[PDB]
Amino acid sequence: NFNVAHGLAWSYYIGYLRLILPELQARIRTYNQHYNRGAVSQRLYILLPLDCGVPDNLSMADPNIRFLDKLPQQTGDRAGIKDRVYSNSIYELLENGQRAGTCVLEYATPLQTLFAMSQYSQAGFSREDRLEQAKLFCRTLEDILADAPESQNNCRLIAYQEPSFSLSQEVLRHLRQE
Amino acid sequence: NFNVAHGLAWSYYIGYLRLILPELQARIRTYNQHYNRGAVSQRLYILLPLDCGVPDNLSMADPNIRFLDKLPQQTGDRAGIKDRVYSNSIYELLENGQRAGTCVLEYATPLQTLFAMSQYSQAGFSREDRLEQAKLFCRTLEDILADAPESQNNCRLIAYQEPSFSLSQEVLRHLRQE
Numbered sequence: 541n542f543n544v545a546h547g548l549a550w551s552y553y554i555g556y557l558r559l560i561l562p563e564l565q566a567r568i569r570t571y572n573q574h575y576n577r578g579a580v581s582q583r584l585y586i587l588l589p590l591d592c593g594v595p596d597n598l599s600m601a602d603p604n605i606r607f608l609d610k611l612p613q614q615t616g617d618r619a620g621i622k623d624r625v626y627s628n629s630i631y632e633l634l635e636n637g638q639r640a641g642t643c644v645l646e647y648a649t650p651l652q653t654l655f656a657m658s659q660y661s662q663a664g665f666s667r668e669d670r671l672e673q674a675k676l677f678c679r680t681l682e683d684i685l686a687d688a689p690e691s692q693n694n695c696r697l698i699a700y701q702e703p704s705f706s707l708s709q710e711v712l713r714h715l716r717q718e
Numbered sequence: 719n720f721n722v723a724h725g726l727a728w729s730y731y732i733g734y735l736r737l738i739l740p741e742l743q744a745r746i747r748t749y750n751q752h753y754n755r756g757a758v759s760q761r762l763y764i765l766l767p768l769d770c771g772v773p774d775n776l777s778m779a780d781p782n783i784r785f786l787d788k789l790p791q792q793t794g795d796r797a798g799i800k801d802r803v804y805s806n807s808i809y810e811l812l813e814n815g816q817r818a819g820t821c822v823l824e825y826a827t828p829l830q831t832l833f834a835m836s837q838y839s840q841a842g843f844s845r846e847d848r849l850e851q852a853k854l855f856c857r858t859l860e861d862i863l864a865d866a867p868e869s870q871n872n873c874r875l876i877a878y879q880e881p882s883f884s885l886s887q888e889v890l891r892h893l894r895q896e
């Protein structure tokens with residue numbers, strides 16, 4: 541099942557990142573000018589927990605990550621679905637009670653597929669293989685984005701293992717660099 | 719890359735079908751009672767062209783398939799995205815100028831990933847392998863749905879090869895049976 545994470549990464553690129561990354565800066569600029577608090581950063585920040593533990597509510601993983609607003613939606617006809625909607629959420633990052641950064645932030649959803657596959661007996665995906673597939677997912681995606689025309693300093697991958705751990709501090713480190 | 723279609727099918731189930739199938743009949747019943755034309759059929763009809771040719775506009779594949787309306791959207795928090803939106807389109811099927819059926823209808827989007835992967839040199843997916851992966855995708859999905867609790871006569875797969883061909887007649891055949 542090595543080809544499992546491989547295909548999921550290509551799917552994530554083909555069916556999502558390549559479609560939304562080109563329009564992202566315009567959506568952010570629209571938000572910055574129309575519905576606004578400091579400036580939203582210019583990159584999509586993608587969280588890649590190698591334990592494939594992907595909560596649906598980000599504030600649950602860390603209270604210092606607080607939902608601010610939704611980006612204006614992106615829509616288009618997709619595979620027979622009229623006006624399919626692509627949604628992204630903006631988060632504020634707090635640090636000792638100060639707003640320290642603002643960004644479009646989400647988990648890489650395919651890591652949730654890896655996790656659920658490892659739970660379903662019919663998937664033939666060993667629970668022991670979650671970390672290995674997660675790593676391959678990250679490496680594949682990294683190699684894809686390194687060479688993708690739509691990636692132009694508008695995407696940032698954040699991969700990490702928890703062994704304390706501060707997810708907000710991990711994100712702020714990448715924001716600081718930018 | 720056999721594991722390619724395998725993973726895509728499990729992804730399609732885990733990240734989509736298992737989430738939307740349980741609520742689908744209530745969304746259809748809501749539409750039937752609130753925004754209505756004959757009754758919308760009770761199953762989600764999924765188109766699986768084995769040539770992986772997936773137009774984004776269904777009326778383009780066959781003019782006898784005409785967009786009627788959107789189902790009421792489904793939303794939930796998903797992997798850090800607040801109120802992620804799941805959308806489905808309702809279509810009327812015409813037959814010699816008569817409205818002959820009405821259903822929720824779409825292409826299986828992962829077939830688009832197979833297709834695009836076969837085009838990208840970095841994916842290492844042979845163009846010659848599209849039909850084989852498409853078949854495996856269909857077989858895997860079929861085996862998944864055969865045993866899935868959320869599938870309860872509310873999903874129908876329509877797989878086909880074009881060698882004339884009438885996509886509308888192919889769909890109407892399955893609707894007739896139901």
Ligand SMILES: Nc1nc2c(ncn2[C@@H]2O[C@@H]3COP(=O)(O)O[C@@H]4[C@H](O)[C@@H](COP(=O)(O)O[C@H]3[C@H]2O)O[C@H]4n2cnc3c(N)ncnc32)c(=O)[nH]1
Pocket residue numbers: 548551552553554555556621624625626627649650653729730732733734735799802803804805806824826827828831
């Ligand atoms: N009609 C309809 N179908 C939907 C919708 N959302 C998902 N589907 C179907 O489920 C497959 C898996 O979805 P996922 O959210 O678990 O992750 C996908 C996948 O890893 C990768 C490629 O997507 P696609 O090829 O369209 O496969 C999707 C589809 O067949 O990108 C991820 N992804 C796709 N859309 C989003 C999004 N809006 N936000 C975050 N991640 C996404 C739906 O709304 N309607």
